[PDB]
Design a protein around this ligand. Structure first.
Ligand SMILES: *[C@@H]1O[C@H](CO)[C@@H](O)[C@H](O)[C@H]1NC(C)=O
Ligand SMILES: *[C@@H]1O[C@H](CO)[C@@H](O)[C@H](O)[C@H]1NC(C)=O
Ligand SMILES: *[C@@H]1O[C@H](CO)[C@@H](O)[C@H](O)[C@H]1NC(C)=O
Ligand SMILES: *[C@@H]1O[C@H](CO)[C@@H](O)[C@H](O)[C@H]1NC(C)=O
Ligand SMILES: [Hg+2]
Ligand SMILES: [Hg+2]
Length: 172
């Protein structure tokens, strides 16, 4: 209305910018989607449609972010890329003799990755119960019920993969 608003630094405007990781199974590479409304500019590497493409799993990549609405210095964003989605398998560990009263689900690490495992979190939702662990086991379940158990894997609190398992408390 009056005086033109002071432009912030791009490092100021995008200091807390978030990213979503989208795996391409064909290329075995990740795309980082920048969670911003405006069409941002990236130096040197391109970020067409606010996406940084062809990122190798478990490797840090840096992207300098700017826009006309903000001044220098650029926001230097470190992309801590997660492990490949095909390196994890959701396995049903339920013992067949106890299938009527138990659920056992476990994520299996089917191939090695260099990312630190301390930043890897596994979450499960069976019914409406939420678990945080690589493996979950429920016992004393009432027979003849059906549950949709949803699970996701986070890297630095970033969901990069997920899967579902429908389990019945019976023998077949
Ligand atoms: C990304 O990878 C794909 C598949 O390997 C390739 O066709 C493309 O040229 C790469 N480069 C960019 C910037 O998308
Ligand atoms: C990768 O990025 C994270 C976050 O910035 C950092 O803490 C870590 O030191 C980096 N890894 C290496 C090998 O420098
Ligand atoms: C490890 O991962 C957590 C997320 O679970 C992250 O917040 C933290 O910065 C990381 N710590 C180290 C020492 O790499
Ligand atoms: C997996 O993630 C997608 C979004 O990436 C979401 O639409 C879906 O509901 C998720 N849940 C499961 C368990 O597949
Ligand atoms: Hg399996
Ligand atoms: Hg493989």
């Amino acid at each position: 209305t009056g005086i033109e608003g002071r432009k912030p630094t791009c490092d100021e405007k995008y200091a807390n910018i978030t990213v979503d990781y989208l795996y391409n199974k064909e290329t075995k590479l990740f795309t980082a989607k920048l969670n911003v409304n405006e069409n941002v500019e990236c130096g040197n590497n391109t970020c067409t449609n606010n996406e940084v493409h062809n990122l190798t799993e478990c490797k840090n990549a840096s992207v300098s972010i700017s826009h006309n609405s903000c001044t220098a210095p650029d926001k230097t964003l470190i992309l801590d890329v997660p492990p490949g989605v095909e390196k994890f398998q959701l396995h049903d560990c339920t013992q067949v003799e106890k299938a009527d009263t138990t659920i056992c689900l476990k994520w299996k690490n089917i191939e090695t990755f260099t990312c630190d495992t301390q930043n890897i979190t596994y979450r499960f939702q069976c019914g409406n119960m939420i678990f945080d662990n690589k493996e979950i086991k429920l016992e004393n379940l009432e027979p003849e019920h059906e549950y949709k158990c949803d699970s996701e894997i986070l890297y630095n609190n970033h969901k990069f993969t997920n899967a579902s398992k429908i389990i019945k408390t019976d023998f077949g």
